[PDB]
Every structure is written in structure tokens, then in C-alpha cells.
Amino acid sequence: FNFNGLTGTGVLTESNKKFLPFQQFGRDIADTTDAVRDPQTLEILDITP
């Protein structure tokens, strides 16, 4: 997957996280992206290698 230039690798699943409208990226303890919004559609996605 490649969202807005952010390369990654894993499976994209539906996420129940509730992002505020002004947030786009979620991170874990190890500073690794785990949640991201589709630029075109406003649903939230979960990332897991």
C-alpha cells in the first residue's frame, strides 16, 4: 500500500478507531504507523504485517 507517499507492507483491515477530523496517522509505542485514512474515502483502516 502507498497512501500519500507513505510506503508500507501488511494487511489492511477495518478499524474501529475513532479519529478526530484533523488527525490522519496513528502510531504505536515503537513509532510505527498502525491506522490511516483513505485520502479519497473517509473510512479508517488498520495496518498489521
Place this chain on the structure above:
Amino acid sequence: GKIQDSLSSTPSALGKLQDVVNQNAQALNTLVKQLSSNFGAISSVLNDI
């Protein structure tokens, strides 16, 4: 019979054995947390760089 109550008296009775697993989880947690440091580089994300 006293042994039954003495063990259930205080939770810290197993301190000599509890610290073994706490130290292992403590040191391992810091190892993954250290991955967020950039070590003077541009960023801590190898995929992005």
C-alpha cells in the same frame, strides 16, 4: 494451616519469584521502545528514508 493463610495474607510474599518475570518484561520493553530514536539521522522510519 498457617501456611494457607500466610501466603494469602500479603501479595508481596512471592517477591523473590515475581521480580524474575518483571525484569525480563522490563528489559524487553525498552528494546522495542528504543526503535523510535533517530540516532541523529533524519527520521526513525527506514521505509520512509
Place this chain on the structure above:
Amino acid sequence: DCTMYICGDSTECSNLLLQYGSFCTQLNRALTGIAVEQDKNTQEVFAQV
């Protein structure tokens, strides 16, 4: 204490230590673990009555 040795009395160098993460936080835990041990050893070897 790490900040007084590596970047002692300098604010410019103090900021640059944060980008390395928590190296010297580990050292403080290491040297305090043996410090308590030294006070412990005197208690088994002497305080037996």
C-alpha cells in the same frame, strides 16, 4: 548522572541527548540495582541474630 558528564553545564548539548532516547535512564537503573545489593549483603552476613 548522565547529563552532568556527557553534556555537563551546556544546554545546547543537553538537547542533543534527547534524540538518542533513553540510554542513560538505563544506566541509572543499573547502578541503583547494585547499590541496594551492597546494603543487602551486609544484612545476611551480619544481621543473623
